[PDB]
Amino acid sequence: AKYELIGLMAYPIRHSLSPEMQNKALEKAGLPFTYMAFEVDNDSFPGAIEGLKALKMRGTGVSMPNKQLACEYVDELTPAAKLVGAINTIVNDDGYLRGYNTDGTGHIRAIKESGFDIKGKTMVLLGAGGASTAIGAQGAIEGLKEIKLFNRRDEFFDKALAFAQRVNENTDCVVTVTDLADQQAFAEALASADILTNGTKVGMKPLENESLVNDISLLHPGLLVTECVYNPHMTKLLQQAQQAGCKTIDGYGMLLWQGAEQFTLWTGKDFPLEYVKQVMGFGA
Amino acid sequence: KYELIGLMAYPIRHSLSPEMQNKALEKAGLPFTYMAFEVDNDSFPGAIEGLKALKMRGTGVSMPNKQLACEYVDELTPAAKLVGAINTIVNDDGYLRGYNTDGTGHIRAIKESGFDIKGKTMVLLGAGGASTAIGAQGAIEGLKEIKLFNRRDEFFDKALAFAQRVNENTDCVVTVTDLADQQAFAEALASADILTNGTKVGMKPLENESLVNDISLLHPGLLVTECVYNPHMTKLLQQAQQAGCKTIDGYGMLLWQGAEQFTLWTGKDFPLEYVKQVMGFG
Numbered sequence: 378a379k380y381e382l383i384g385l386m387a388y389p390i391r392h393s394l395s396p397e398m399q400n401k402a403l404e405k406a407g408l409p410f411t412y413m414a415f416e417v418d419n420d421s422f423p424g425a426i427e428g429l430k431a432l433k434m435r436g437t438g439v440s441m442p443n444k445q446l447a448c449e450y451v452d453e454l455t456p457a458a459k460l461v462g463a464i465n466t467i468v469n470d471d472g473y474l475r476g477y478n479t480d481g482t483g484h485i486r487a488i489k490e491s492g493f494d495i496k497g498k499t500m501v502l503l504g505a506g507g508a509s510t511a512i513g514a515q516g517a518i519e520g521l522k523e524i525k526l527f528n529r530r531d532e533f534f535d536k537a538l539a540f541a542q543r544v545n546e547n548t549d550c551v552v553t554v555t556d557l558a559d560q561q562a563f564a565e566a567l568a569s570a571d572i573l574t575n576g577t578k579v580g581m582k583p584l585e586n587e588s589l590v591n592d593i594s595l596l597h598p599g600l601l602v603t604e605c606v607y608n609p610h611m612t613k614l615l616q617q618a619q620q621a622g623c624k625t626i627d628g629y630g631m632l633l634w635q636g637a638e639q640f641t642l643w644t645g646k647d648f649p650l651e652y653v654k655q656v657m658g659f660g661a
Numbered sequence: 662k663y664e665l666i667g668l669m670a671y672p673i674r675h676s677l678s679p680e681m682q683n684k685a686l687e688k689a690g691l692p693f694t695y696m697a698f699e700v701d702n703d704s705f706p707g708a709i710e711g712l713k714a715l716k717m718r719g720t721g722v723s724m725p726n727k728q729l730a731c732e733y734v735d736e737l738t739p740a741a742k743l744v745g746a747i748n749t750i751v752n753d754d755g756y757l758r759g760y761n762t763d764g765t766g767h768i769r770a771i772k773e774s775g776f777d778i779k780g781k782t783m784v785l786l787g788a789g790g791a792s793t794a795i796g797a798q799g800a801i802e803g804l805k806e807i808k809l810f811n812r813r814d815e816f817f818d819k820a821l822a823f824a825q826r827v828n829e830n831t832d833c834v835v836t837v838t839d840l841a842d843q844q845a846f847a848e849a850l851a852s853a854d855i856l857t858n859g860t861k862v863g864m865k866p867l868e869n870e871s872l873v874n875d876i877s878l879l880h881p882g883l884l885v886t887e888c889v890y891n892p893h894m895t896k897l898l899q900q901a902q903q904a905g906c907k908t909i910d911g912y913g914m915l916l917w918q919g920a921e922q923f924t925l926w927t928g929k930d931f932p933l934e935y936v937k938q939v940m941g942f943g
């Protein structure tokens with residue numbers, strides 16, 4: 378009876394790995410919090426937030442299709458989340474709601490944890506969806522000199538443009554958006570890049586048999602390559618990077634660090650990352 | 662995949678409901694989790710918004726929201742309408758049903774000892790949540806007469822009106838006597854099968870008293886029930902036991918009340934003997 382509730386507001390909720398990860402981390406540390414998932418869409422989201430406040434829930438993770446909508450229900454968003462226009466985390470600080478995007482802080486935390494310094498580097502970002510804008514937003518916020526966002530001409534292209542505009546106009550980070558079709562612009566981008574980051578669905582099943590990088594000669598050792606895809610754990614892009622001497626960061630790195638960021642936001646304590654890693658079976 | 666079952670009250674710190682329900686849930690491996698939420702009259706309406714939006718299976722309700730909660734359910738039981746307060750809400754696809762298991766619980770605890778409430782005469786001490794719950798249910802289930810005594814406080818008037826609702830909707834006879842009429846108390850008692858305390862007397866910081874100043878108001882063979890369960894053995898029960906007469910304690914009510922809630926939420930049978938032992942109610 379002394380535990381606070383932390384939710385997950387989304388629909389569907391069947392395939393989430395947050396519940397087990399947060400709860401196992403919580404048990405390990407013996408903290409007075411319980412994590413539960415709830416089926417919430419755009420129509421019930423407003424009443425769910427009223428519940429969050431009335432019941433004094435500690436917070437809630439947020440997923441499709443409520444991430445953009447949730448931005449309208451918090452009192453405060455971080456500068457990175459305002460760039461993104463979407464949050465996956467809400468923290469209830471005694472009635473005052475703070476909105477965060479731990480996908481961006483997590484991925485950026487995973488990078489730093491490897492001993493890589495973000496400040497002033499050049500990132501070649503593939504995609505402009507939820508993972509990519511969150512990643513680039515935080516990256517800009519933490520000092521990236523430039524971001525060479527490459528996105529095909531699909532339903533996300535204009536999104537890339539506004540994102541670049543927002544990041545450009547609100548940060549000292551220089552973002553350019555280039556059409557993926559221009560392979561030479563891509564070749565020059567990669568050569569000048571310190572980090573290659575895939576935030577697209579390419580690499581994830583069923584498309585598990587492809588990368589946005591046609592030839593490994595396009596990559597150069599010394600380049601750090603990060604992957605958002607965690608299914609499969611070993612993407613084609615990752616294998617290219619490992620077959621080119623590049624240092625790497627897999628999907629599990631972002632997933633675990635992202636979970637950590639949420640955990641600390643809600644508990645104030647450090648996340649037992651190695652433990653959660655083994656317990657969830659992300660080690661093999 | 663688990664559904665939430667809450668408790669909406671303030672305070673919540675002392676409630677034994679969370680442990681009982683979660684022990685019972687865990688014993689059967691049921692896909693539900695019970696959790697207490699600190700909620701009062703001002704946050705109750707938003708908390709109900711939350712029960713619907715989050716799709717909770719339901720929620721237990723305790724002070725100070727039992728009366729207010731009746732205005733937030735789509736449907737209430739006949740007993741609940743007589744009491745004017747509920748301790749239980751069940752959410753059936755957005756449709757909310759209110760029940761007062763405190764009534765059914767106490768009555769079930771009585772029937773369970775081997776005693777039949779039909780046609781009997783109960784001397785009912787009190788007019789709060791416990792007493793009106795018990796009286797409502799007891800009346801509905803064939804109680805011939807309810808003689809309730811209450812001091813001249815804020816619950817006296819509530820007692821009068823309560824009596825009226827019951828007297829008007831049941832075949833039960835209910836009277837309201839000033840607890841200060843020591844004579845009527847001994848007399849209206851004299852002819853009684855059941856003595857039931859629903860007041861706070863017996864519970865700390867009133868653990869040294871009883872509303873029974875004499876045993877000659879007790880015919881050892883009589884039935885004395887106590888709502889108080891802190892302490893387990895109240896002075897009113899300690900007298901009764903030494904008096905020789907048979908009694909039903911607060912634990913009986915607590916467990917049967919909890920059982921009803923559990924079955925309403927889960928559809929399963931409550932593991933009462935297990936919870937009893939685990940809770941150390943033995």
Ligand SMILES: NC(=O)c1ccc[n+]([C@@H]2O[C@H](COP(=O)([O-])OP(=O)(O)OC[C@H]3O[C@@H](n4cnc5c(N)ncnc54)[C@H](O)[C@@H]3O)[C@@H](O)[C@H]2O)c1
Nearest residue numbers: 504505506507508529533576577578581605606628631632
């Ligand atoms: N590791 C983690 O913690 C984590 C967290 C979030 C998302 N992800 C993963 O990251 C990936 C992206 O998810 P999201 O939510 O941002 O997706 P999203 O639907 O919001 O956007 C997908 C992006 O991929 C690009 N894309 C898709 N197919 C493409 C193709 N064939 N060629 C070129 N571009 C293509 C789109 O233009 C778009 O910019 C998914 O694999 C998801 O599983 C991982």
Ligand SMILES: NC(=O)c1ccc[n+]([C@@H]2O[C@H](COP(=O)([O-])OP(=O)(O)OC[C@H]3O[C@@H](n4cnc5c(N)ncnc54)[C@H](O)[C@@H]3O)[C@@H](O)[C@H]2O)c1
Nearest residue numbers: 787788789790791812816859860861864888889911914915
């Ligand atoms: N065992 C269970 O399941 C269960 C359930 C509910 C309540 N309870 C217990 O029942 C008792 C009553 O709780 P409630 O919710 O009905 O309280 P309540 O506030 O609603 O009503 C209190 C009643 O006690 C009377 N009273 C208070 N002090 C008195 C005094 N000094 N002398 C005479 N009468 C006095 C009042 O007039 C009133 O009628 C408490 O001990 C509570 O813990 C037990």
